[PDB]
Design a protein around this nucleic acid. Sequence first.
RNA 1: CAGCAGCAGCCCGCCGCCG
RNA 2: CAGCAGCAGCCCGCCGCCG
Lengths: 122, 122
Amino acid sequence: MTSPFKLPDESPSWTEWRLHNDETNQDNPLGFKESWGFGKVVFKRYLRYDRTEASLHRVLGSWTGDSVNYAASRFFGFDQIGCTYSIRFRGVSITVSGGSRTLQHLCEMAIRSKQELLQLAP
Amino acid sequence: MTSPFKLPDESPSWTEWRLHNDETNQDNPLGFKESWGFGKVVFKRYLRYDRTEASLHRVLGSWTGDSVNYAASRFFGFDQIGCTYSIRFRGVSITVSGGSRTLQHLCEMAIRSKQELLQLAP
RNA sequence: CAGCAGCAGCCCGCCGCCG
RNA sequence: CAGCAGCAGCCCGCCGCCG
């Protein structure tokens, strides 16, 4: 399976996550989760994010309209399939979803949702 | 039930909707649908929207952080409940959801999602 | 636009068990 | 952070019937 993502997953081990809980707080997690679904197949990432501009720029590079289109187009055919982007950060989940015909518009709304959620104030 | 919405619903009748289909196209609907859910209770609106600045300003007034908090607080208690905003326009659905503890953050992301979707280019 | 139904998926809240 | 399970809701895609 070719993934829509350009960065590898960064899920913390159970021990790393416990170490982080012990030393921080829902509003200061190690990072965020995001996922892309195309019909029944779902790709997920956990990515480290520390709220600096450097870190925001890095994690905004985790998928592009091109990389999502390349991965999704594996699953395309005559009938439309459902496509969905989800992102969860600090207790708030955003999902952008529609049919594969509207995929470009879904990626534009998904990237804007991602940037707005990751920059949401204190 | 006190609604989170400050404008009445504007669902078209079946006949009005058919008249509009006949004379337009998924990218030029009469308006958009939006909904607020608080535990099991859901409030919905269809609102007319024609993509002008006047119209965008009007429909952005359909709920505020205050009006959503007043409606949601009817359903609050000790345990958190799930809160969800959804908006669908031109084939793309955005859902912002989380627990009632994060409701203010959900409203901030919901209003930004709404403005960004309603202004999405051709 | 509305309503009912089938198939499939995702997301949220509560809650248990578990690495 | 991961996995399995229960209860409830929402959203998406396909599809039928219907005002």
